[PDB]
Amino acid sequence: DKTVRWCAVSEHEATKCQSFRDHMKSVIPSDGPSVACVKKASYLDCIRAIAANEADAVTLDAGLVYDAYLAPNNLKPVVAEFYGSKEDPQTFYYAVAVVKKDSGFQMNQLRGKKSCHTGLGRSAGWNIPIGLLYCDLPEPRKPLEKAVANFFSGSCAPCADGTDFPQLCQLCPGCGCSTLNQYFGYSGAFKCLKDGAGDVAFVEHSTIFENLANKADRDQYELLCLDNTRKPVDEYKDCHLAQVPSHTVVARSMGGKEDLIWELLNQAQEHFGKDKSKEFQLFSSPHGKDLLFEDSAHGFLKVPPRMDAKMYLGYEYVTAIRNLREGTC
Ligand SMILES: [Fe+3]
């Protein structure tokens, strides 16, 4: 049974998935790799179904990949997204902070501002920015959600617990953890800024371009530099908050079909990659943005043999992620 069951987070992803399934079935030979679609309400449900052996694969932001290795799930990153170009594969991205032109604040002064995050635990939208302000938060810095809550004057942090920390969903009631929530994810976080619901969107250098196709309309937005200055949105190389490692497909440590997933995905990038088949597209969709994989991807690279989650993220990010709950100041 050479069939990879991919975990679709919710109605939109599911539809991309069912047509991912369908087009692969027709272009790929009878005995090649198959794909099946399992729908779940959230990545976190996808982590658990995979460990429970009801699915095989799901693409996660790096921040989440760490959550996924943590017991009792024990998932490994297995195939990485890459950006830039096929000719020049980029296995990382810039985390930035996007803002409107002429509007006061800088990095060192984000108290009482309204904020749009991609999601709780995700790299650019959460782990990086929150980690930068960890110690300036008001004590007690535990639990984190509470402390980020009081620190802004309203937020959207997808996947957070709306009933426990109600101010982290003030900008997106329910803190929906799927594209259903329009303020969820990178393009979701950015839409949240555009509509003036929030003062800053913590996203990735590609987001603004993925979401606004006019250099005219973009001159209206700026980035927050670390040295408490602002810069035009195409100058991210010089005004980013941190570099983080690319989203990876994660899979079971034991019996995980890691080899089968690579054969699926690497055949997928052949037929339905960037400007390949008019028909189906792996890194875009009519149904939405960043479904099953980031639109900003160009392809996949195999994660080097037996590199577990800790090894993938880097030593000082893993230390960062942890001390983003515990280490004093
Ligand atoms: Fe990310």
Swiss-Prot record:
Transferrins are iron binding transport proteins which can bind two Fe(3+) ions in association with the binding of an anion, usually bicarbonate. It is responsible for the transport of iron from sites of absorption and heme degradation to those of storage and utilization. Serum transferrin may also have a further role in stimulating cell proliferation. Fe(3+) 1 binds at D61, Y93, Y186, H247. Monomer. Part of a complex composed of SLC40A1/ferroportin, TF/transferrin and HEPH/hephaestin that transfers iron from cells to transferrin. (Microbial infection) Binds to Neisseria transferrin-binding protein A (tbpA or tbp1). Forms a large complex with TbpA and TbpB. It comes from the Eukaryota. Hydrogencarbonate 1 binds at T118, R122, A124, G125. It comes from Homo sapiens. This is Serotransferrin. Glycans are attached at S30. Belongs to the transferrin family. Has a bilobed structure, each lobe binds a single Fe(3+) ion. Does not always bind 2 Fe(3+) ions. Changing D275G: In allele TF*D1. The modification Dimethylated arginine is found at R21. Residues 4-326 form the Transferrin-like domain. Expressed by the liver and secreted in plasma.
